[PDB]
């Protein structure tokens, strides 16, 4: 199935929606799964939050991968245990153009349903484990530019709605 989804852009408030928890993993879950990745990929991003893309359910997509054929999928993602700090200058595809350095723990332990709706456990680190955490924020109506001061928050706002005016 080609994918349809719309990624959401600040300041869109459905962005700050705090998505449910999956009631079962059936085939409309597994297209939903399959249509973010789609979108994912399409867009150049390495993860997709459901929230993104205005489905407010907790389901998150993953491919930290070059190649492209890492498919990681959590379902009701659970954080079990972090550790350490670091940061990155993330971006987002909700927040295009703009980046900037975040705190996130080094690593982290997560429980999660897979695609099929198989539990599993995965402990990560670096890029994959900030990942984790950015996708995680989404599903509570968390953005990364919430780390930053406000003032940094309203550039961040204006420059995108800027972009956004000018395309079209
Ligand atoms: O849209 C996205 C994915 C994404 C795009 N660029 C990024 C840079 C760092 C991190 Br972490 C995540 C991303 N997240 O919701
Ligand atoms: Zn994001």
Wanted: charged share 35%.
């Amino acid at each position: 199935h080609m994918s349809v989804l719309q990624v959401l852009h600040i300041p869109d408030e459905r962005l700050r929606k705090v998505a449910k928890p999956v009631e079962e993993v059936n085939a409309e879950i597994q297209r939903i799964v399959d249509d973010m990745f789609e979108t994912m990929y399409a867009e150049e991003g390495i993860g997709l939050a459901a929230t993104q893309v205005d489905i407010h359910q907790r389901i998150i997509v993953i491919d930290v991968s070059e190649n492209r054929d890492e498919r990681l999928v959590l379902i009701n993602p659970e954080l079990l245990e972090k550790s350490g700090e670091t940061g990155i200058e993330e971006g987002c595809l909700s927040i295009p153009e703009q980046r900037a350095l975040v705190p996130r723990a080094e690593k982290v332990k997560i429980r999660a349903l897979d695609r099929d709706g198989k539990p599993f456990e995965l402990e990560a680190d670096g890029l994959l484990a900030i990942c984790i955490q950015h996708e995680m924020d989404h599903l509570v109506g968390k953005l990364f530019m919430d780390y930053l001061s406000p003032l940094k928050q309203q550039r961040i706002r204006q420059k995108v709605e800027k972009l956004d005016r000018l395309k079209a």
